[PDB]
Amino acid sequence: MKILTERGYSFVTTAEREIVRDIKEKLCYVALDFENEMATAASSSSLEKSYELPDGQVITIGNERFRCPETLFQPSFIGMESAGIHETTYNSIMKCDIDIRKDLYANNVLSGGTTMYPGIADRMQKEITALAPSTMKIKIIAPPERKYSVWIGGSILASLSTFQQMWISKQEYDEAGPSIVHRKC
Amino acid sequence: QLVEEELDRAQERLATALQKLEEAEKAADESERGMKVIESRAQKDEEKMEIQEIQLKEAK
């Protein structure tokens, strides 16, 4: 919403925020190499696509398409101090015991909606490969339905027979108070 | 006789005009049908083209 104002389009309402969310879900992708992608978009106009708001009024966006999700890898674009998702993944790995991180390097599982951009698995693998030692096999696992992985796994879990003793019954709550939840389960 | 001759001649010509209008609106209907099917086809083709071009992008 903030980066689209430099082309003239101004979305300020909450409804317009929903419109911009739809634009993001339809036109944005992750660039494998950000710098030369930027130079390419500057040179030609083959990256420009068009979107039609729900009153006519087509809008055309250029390098915004990949500048929007690039923030995941350079969170300094929005004034945050953290590191990109590739770097926090690598740090979380390197915070684990040296014997399991070879098997962690090869089972990076992606989940949730924000991991649905075209080309995010390739960029992620490139970055982690550049960070990790040159002997490990980096494998990014990105299922085609990863937007509902949490719900699917939750149904699998709640269906297990060995899980039917892990519920928090009403009686346990009546005994222990709301603090039952984290104190035991 | 001028009154009644203008009357019935203009009336039958008005009938011909309304039939021409019905023909014109049916032409509008068929043209609109062609337009809608063709634009839907164009939409499908364009979205598939975009999928395939980005697939070549990732592949290469």
Ligand SMILES: Nc1ncnc2c1ncn2[C@@H]1O[C@H](COP(=O)(O)OP(=O)(O)O)[C@@H](O)[C@H]1O
């Ligand atoms: N195809 C897509 N491409 C890019 N982003 C998407 C896509 N689909 C959803 N999103 C983003 O994912 C978010 C919703 O994802 P979701 O996993 O449902 O989050 P939550 O689990 O918190 O509800 C939205 O903010 C939207 O911007």
